[PDB]
Design a protein around this ligand. Sequence first.
Ligand SMILES: O=c1[nH]cc(F)c(=O)[nH]1
Ligand SMILES: O=c1[nH]cc(F)c(=O)[nH]1
Lengths: 112, 112, 98, 98
Amino acid sequence: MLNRVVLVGRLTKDPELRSTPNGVNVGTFTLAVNRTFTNAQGEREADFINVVVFKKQAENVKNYLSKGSLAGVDGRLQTRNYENKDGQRVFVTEVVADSVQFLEPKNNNQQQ
Amino acid sequence: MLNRVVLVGRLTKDPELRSTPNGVNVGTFTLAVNRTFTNAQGEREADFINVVVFKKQAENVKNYLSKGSLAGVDGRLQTRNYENKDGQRVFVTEVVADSVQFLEPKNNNQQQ
Amino acid sequence: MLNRVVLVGRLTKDPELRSTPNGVNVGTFTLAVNRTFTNAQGEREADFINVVVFKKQAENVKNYLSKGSLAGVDGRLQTRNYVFVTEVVADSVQFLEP
Amino acid sequence: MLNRVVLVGRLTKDPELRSTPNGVNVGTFTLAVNRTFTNAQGEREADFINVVVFKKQAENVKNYLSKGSLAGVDGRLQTRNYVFVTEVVADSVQFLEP
Ligand SMILES: O=c1[nH]cc(F)c(=O)[nH]1
Ligand SMILES: O=c1[nH]cc(F)c(=O)[nH]1
């Protein structure tokens, strides 16, 4: 069934890259996306989307993407449930990126 | 900034419609979206997206949408943080629908 | 760069199916997409989008999709030339009717 | 019915700005959208999409957007006629450069 997400935002931290003994690399980062419908002084808010990326895309994210860089994301919305180390159920909604595009560096509105 | 979600899935329960004394109606429902990339016998999984709808769209959802109906959704991805009644922080990612389209009823693959 | 199109409409005619000299199936159809909001006059307009789909999905388009069938399409917007033509290249198609 | 297009590309020429006899500003520009994946030969192709934007957004397109400027576009796919023309009608435009 149809499931498509497109985002443009800025990374809040530098991307992390973990791995499982199953041998696959899993990159994660948070995308801060300012709301367009409230972009005006006195009411600018952002949403913070969790993006997850795997395999090849995941390493090109760790190399070339840094905290504060503008990135575009294209993917699916997916949900998980796990148990944290305390025994509480955790429900997650993340964007699984099919492609991540590097748009602008960290400080492009003062450097340009 | 760009933020677009498009979904087609089936409702897991009947939509709920709450209200605040601020006088605005807030409709909510969960959309179950089968993954396209695993649609085959032996590996069909779905993701369960929380959709939120307001004002007029929200009532036309409660009238005309029921558990098991196929619905299409178009909107933004948004995040909230609140405190539940126990004092734990709760982080939510939901789809805020701009439009909700009614596609097929509950039992359309046996009635058609 | 990002390029994504998502559509839901009905086919105007029956899906067509050709092949490439490389042996790849090329399914085509036109989708009538009603506008969700009416226009200044109140009438409902539809747009007529040309969709293209490849390989085995194109065969399932030919088998299970007919004139008037409701379909969802997910893909890219691409431009071709001779007369400039724009079509949606579907990587995914969803069959909303049996 | 659902109809959504999202694009990121660069303008091929300078944005144009006309008006309707009803007094609404109509901004137009062409966006060159590079394909993310290369083709069977390995070359990178771009698509050239016609974008249309209205009212005050069209004015901010004329002020702040120039040939070669990077822009994001969010809107509908619509079809017009005389020669069949398909354009993206932008409800939102994002300026990726100052
Ligand atoms: O009714 C139609 N209008 C336009 C078309 F391209 C088509 O196939 N059918
Ligand atoms: O280089 C270009 N190709 C096609 C176009 F429509 C255009 O404006 N520019």
